Design a protein around this nucleic acid. Sequence first.
RNA 1: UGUCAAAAU
Length: 358
Amino acid sequence: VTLQDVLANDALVEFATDKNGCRFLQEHYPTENDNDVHQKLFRKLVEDRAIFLSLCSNMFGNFFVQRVLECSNTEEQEILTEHLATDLYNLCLDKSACRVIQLAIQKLDVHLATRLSLELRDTHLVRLSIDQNGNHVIQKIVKTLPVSSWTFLVDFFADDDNLIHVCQDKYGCRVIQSTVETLSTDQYAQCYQHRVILLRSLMAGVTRNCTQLASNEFANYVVQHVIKCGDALAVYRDIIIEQCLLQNLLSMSQEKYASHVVEVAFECAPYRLVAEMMNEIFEGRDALDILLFHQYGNYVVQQMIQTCVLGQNARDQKQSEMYGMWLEKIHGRVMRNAHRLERFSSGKKIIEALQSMS
RNA sequence: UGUCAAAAU
């Protein structure tokens, strides 16, 4: 069998819907754009829009379409962009066609992929951001294309309700993370700070709603990302710590999901905010006794122990002395209630750590 | 002793 056989029999669909036939088409498809067999196969692919869009939706057919994307020049890409734009929203939600869309985002010329990105502006973006398939399309656009192709997403997520729904979703939290990273990893090389204004418009909702976001089963991760980020998002980290966590550390160390946020905050914060957090913990049966004997706050106590142990090895010796004070206070309270703590592993681990350091 | 943590052959 050869390709002239499938061109003469008009059987492109019948091999591309088969596994072995599509692998034959992929292995023998000519890569040079001026080959006649290349052009005849391309015409048979794109001459009927319904056939093309059904081949994009196929379990085995899509791959051949993806190979046609890898070999394509600008004239072929214009036709492909028009056919994809006619059904882009359902193509993004499909298990097979979304991979064609993602490869198109990587491989098309930037104005063509910009056109496809801006086609989605008036669709249902929450539904697209929370789908198992379309989330990856949104992330591919954000991490691939320049920002002017997707600032409508920053405007969309500037609304508070939209942010909460996407951030609290299993998949949309990943979308929020990728957008914050892309807008923060850059702006450093920029001279006019265009991306950090967009990042401030995005992070205003996060700081405005971060108590509910930190208490959530999926949005907590997003709240941990900012705090764990570093100097790129350090201002927003410090805003979250001074506004949300302070005067609420006793409550959220006891919650199932927000205790991870409190733990990450003890792990990654400046000394002033750490000192204010230790002030809140040691100055409310008081708060440290509650957190030693709690199913979630015990891990917060362990994190305080670890950030005092690694904290003592510091250049400024005043901060190191305060770290020693805090660790000595924790050590004294644990040796006061060691008898009961030994009953549960919650305490065995805490003691083992306090034993490691004498 | 604590989290549902990302879609094809």
